[PDB]
Write a structure and sequence with these properties.
Organism: Dictyostelium discoideum
CATH topology of the largest domain: Kinesin
Shape: elongated
Distance between the termini: 34 Å
Radius of gyration: 30 Å
Structural class: alpha+beta
Subunit structure: Myosin-2 heavy chain is two-headed. It self-assembles into filaments. Hexamer of 2 heavy chain subunits (MHC), 2 alkali light chain subunits (MLC) and 2 regulatory light chain subunits (MLC-2). Associates with elmoA.
CATH superfamily of the largest domain: Kinesin motor domain
Function: Myosin is a protein that binds to actin and has ATPase activity that is activated by actin.
Bound molecules: adenosine-5'-diphosphate, beryllium trifluoride ion, magnesium ion
Strand order of the largest sheet: 6-7-19-8-15-11-12
Helix content: 40-55%
Number of strands: 22
Subcellular location: Cytoplasm, Cell cortex
Protein name: Myosin-2 heavy chain
Oligomer: monomer
């Protein structure tokens, strides 16, 4: 058993190394320590101070410098006894303070132990290097083991979910959140690999392969290199792994949320557009290139503006293969693939269209190359296109009259088109995939959510509000859930909100919240950004406690979110909400000779939102998501980024701690710390502590009687612990004191 074979890779890579002895006296120490901030300005920066003396109410310790200081006992951040460094669950910690928590994570990370539990959560810190803990051999060790039986791992929470499903006949969910680059998508892919393996029907299976090939397809079209991650997911996703009554994988379905369409037409410096563009340019066959009027990235406006066309240690040509191979496995025909390619190319050509003026104020196409290129690949009438771009007919109530747009408006229109095409294509892909894997008649499911946690940038826009509104809801669900689950534990053992207000501000109908007001402004063609922001301040400024009207800025507003205050900039919200496309453009494309192209514009499912705004739509998708989640038994994973530099072996204190504060980890410890944080199995207590009392023997039947014995020996406050049917519950700091007692 690799599990009890101290020489196995399991032991080397997932466990804290065990020596020849386990004796209590090993860890004996005379010193006591306290975590302190050497600079009170740097609050997340701590050092360990050794305690020297104590008054009845305060502690006096020695700094690193050799300097002496004092602290109130009630404010002190005591350091846990060394026996606690590296524990697998932060819940076993006696002193539960911020520096203590950070420290356990750190001790673990130093030994490359990236996974740690924190009560209900599985905390996962990005290693930024490969650790061989995801092999088939690793998968087989985790099959059927209880949480406590094995080391923390994504595979373990995945197995727990699976056993619960079979045993309770209840659907399950895994929520994996955290910042960009924290490791969400990596862990998500591990869940799927694990499941496909433990629940798949292979004697060597097709379904299983298809399911596995699904994400690569989506990552090509929805991931991009950003400054925070070379493989950023520019969309949220919910994966439902479907099973039959017997527990075998039977299908799957995918839901996507919020694709960043704007990146297709603009990228920040150093970033890239979606991977596919590069993959196509790099691996199209010489025949494909000519058929697509293809060239180099440098030759395309949508690709030559960031200053970055490739990713280090990444071959777009080689990635292309992988992409195409997945499409093949999944079921896309050569034609369908072909058409996808034409679309991707066409978008590139549209991007090179240059509008010039002079005539007057109207726009003109002196050059017509690119137009022709795109026309061709799209299978549409170039002249129609031209006209639909520069001379859209607009409805003036009675009159349907074609407007002659200036270059700007003409450009912006082409851009809206590109965005419409890309976004529709992505939905088509997802629907396609779902058509192949989705089983109408599934018995049970395990759903995995891979989405960002709270987003707080310099500039926060409409997209960030959507994300933060999602996180307010997820966080609330977490809080409801932990509440029940702690309450249930106390019961089994026989021992003795703010969220809503922010949510209401956002999505309330009466009084109307932010989204309602935005939607209302959305029916007025002539409404502007000022109109809208004036309306928000009118309703909430000095009127809603979660809102803040800035002292000087006239284009922003603040929302107090769970993770802190966020300032939103209103620019372009109206447009974003309406996501407008000229009808003459829709007409142009409706007539495509291309089979997929046509679908993008003729299937209400892909072409239309429902008249629904973008906010309203989102609101609805969130509500269905939440509804499903509410029917599952949830599992929470929090992915943590170690630093903002993408480096291994560099766990930065402030970076980490900020994260732990935003994602709810610290609050749960806070909550937990309040009651009886430590809950030890009677038998286990005795094993270690029998020596402390001139009475008890390590091995006993009446473990409780034993436990009581020691407690009594040491003369411990009956308020410091509660007797449970199986566990002895301990208040914060108590266990540390015991550990601190002499043999
Ligand atoms: N457990 C891990 N082992 C190895 N590399 C990882 C791990 N977690 C994340 N990474 C790395 O960090 C990069 C960012 O991870 P990713 O899953 O894409 O983050 P997220 O989806 O949270 O934005 C990955 O492309 C990979 O290099
Ligand atoms: F960049 Be990660 F996908 F949030
Ligand atoms: Mg991702």
């Amino acid at each position: 058993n690799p599990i009890h074979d101290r020489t196995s890779d399991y032991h080397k890579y997932l466990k804290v190394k065990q020596g020849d002895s386990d004796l209590f006296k090993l860890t004996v120490s005379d010193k006591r320590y306290i975590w302190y901030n050497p600079d009170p300005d740097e609050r997340d920066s701590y050092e360990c101070g050794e305690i020297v003396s104590e008054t009845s109410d305060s502690f006096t310790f020695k700094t690193v410098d050799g300097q002496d200081r004092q602290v109130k006992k009630d404010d002190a951040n005591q350091r846990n006894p060394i026996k606690f460094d590296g524990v697998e669950d932060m819940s076993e910690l006696s002193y539960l303070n911020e520096p203590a928590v950070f420290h356990n994570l750190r001790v673990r990370y130093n030994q490359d132990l990236i996974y740690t539990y924190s009560g209900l959560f599985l905390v996962a810190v990005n290693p930024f290097k490969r650790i061989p803990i995801y092999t088939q051999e690793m998968v087989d060790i985790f099959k059927g083991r209880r949480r406590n039986e094995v080391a923390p791992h994504i595979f373990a929470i995945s197995d727990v979910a699976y056993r619960s499903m079979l045993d309770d006949r209840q659907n399950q969910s895994l929520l994996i959140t955290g910042e960009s680059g924290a490791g969400k998508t990596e862990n998500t892919k591990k869940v799927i690999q694990y499941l496909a393996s433990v629940a798949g029907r292979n004697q060597a299976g097709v379904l299983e392969q298809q399911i596995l090939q699904a994400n690569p397809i989506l990552e090509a079209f929805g991931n991009a290199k950003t400054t925070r991650n070379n493989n950023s997911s520019r969309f949220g996703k919910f994966i439902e792994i479907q099973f039959n009554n017997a527990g075998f994988i039977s299908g799957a379905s995918i839901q996507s949320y919020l694709l960043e369409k704007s990146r297709v037409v603009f990228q920040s410096e150093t970033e890239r557009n979606y991977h596919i563009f590069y993959q196509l340019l790099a691996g199209a066959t010489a025949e494909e290139k000519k058929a697509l009027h293809l060239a180099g990235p440098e030759s395309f406006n949508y690709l030559n503006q960031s200053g970055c066309v490739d990713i280090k240690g990444v071959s777009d040509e080689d990635e292309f293969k992988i992409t195409r191979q997945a499409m093949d496995i999944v079921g896309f025909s050569q034609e369908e693939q072909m058409s996808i390619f034409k679309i991707i190319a066409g978008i590139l050509h549209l991007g090179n269209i240059k509008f010039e003026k002079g005539a007057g104020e109207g726009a003109v196409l002196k050059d017509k190359t690119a137009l022709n290129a795109a026309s061709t690949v799209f299978g549409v009438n170039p002249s129609v296109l031209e006209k639909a771009l520069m001379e859209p007919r607009i409805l003036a109530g009675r009159d349907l009259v074609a407007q002659h747009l200036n270059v700007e408006k003409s450009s912006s229109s082409r851009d809206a088109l590109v965005k419409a095409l890309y976004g529709r294509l992505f939905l088509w892909l997802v629907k396609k995939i779902n058509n192949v894997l989705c089983s109408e008649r599934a018995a049970y499911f395990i759903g995995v959510l891979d989405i960002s946690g709270f987003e707080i940038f310099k500039v926060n826009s409409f997209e960030q509000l959507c994300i933060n509104y999602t996180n307010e809801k997820l966080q609330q669900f977490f809080n409801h859930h932990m509440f029940k689950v702690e309450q249930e534990e106390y019961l089994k053992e026989k021992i003795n909100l703010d969220s809503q207000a922010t949510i209401d501000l956002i999505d309330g109908r009466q009084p109307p919240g932010i989204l309602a007001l935005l939607d209302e402004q959305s029916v007025f063609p002539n409404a502007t950004d000022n109109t809208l922001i004036t309306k928000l301040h009118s309703h909430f400024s000095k009127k809603n406690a979660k809102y803040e009207e800035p002292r000087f800025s006239k284009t922003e507003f603040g929302v107090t979110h769970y993770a802190g205050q966020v300032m939103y900039e209103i620019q372009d919200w109206l447009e974003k909400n309406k996501d407008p496309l000229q009808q003459d453009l829709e007409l142009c494309f409706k007539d495509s000779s291309d089979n997929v192209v046509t679908k993008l514009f003729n299937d209400p499912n892909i072409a239309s939102r429902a008249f629904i705004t973008v906010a309203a739509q989102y609101k609805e998708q969130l509500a269905s998501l939440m509804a499903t989640l509410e029917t599952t038994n949830p599992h929470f994973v929090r992915c943590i980024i170690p630093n903002n530099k993408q480096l291994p072996a560099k766990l930065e204190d402030k970076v980490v701690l900020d994260q732990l504060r935003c994602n709810g980890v610290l609050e749960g410890i806070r909550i937990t710390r309040k009651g009886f944080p430590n809950r030890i199995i009677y038998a286990d207590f005795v094993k270690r502590y029998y020596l402390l009392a001139p009475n008890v023997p390590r091995d006993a039947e009446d473990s409780q009687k034993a436990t009581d014995a020691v407690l009594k020996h040491l003369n411990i406050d009956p308020e410091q612990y509660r007797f449970g049917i199986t566990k002895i519950f301990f208040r914060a700091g108590q266990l540390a004191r015991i550990e601190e007692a002499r043999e």
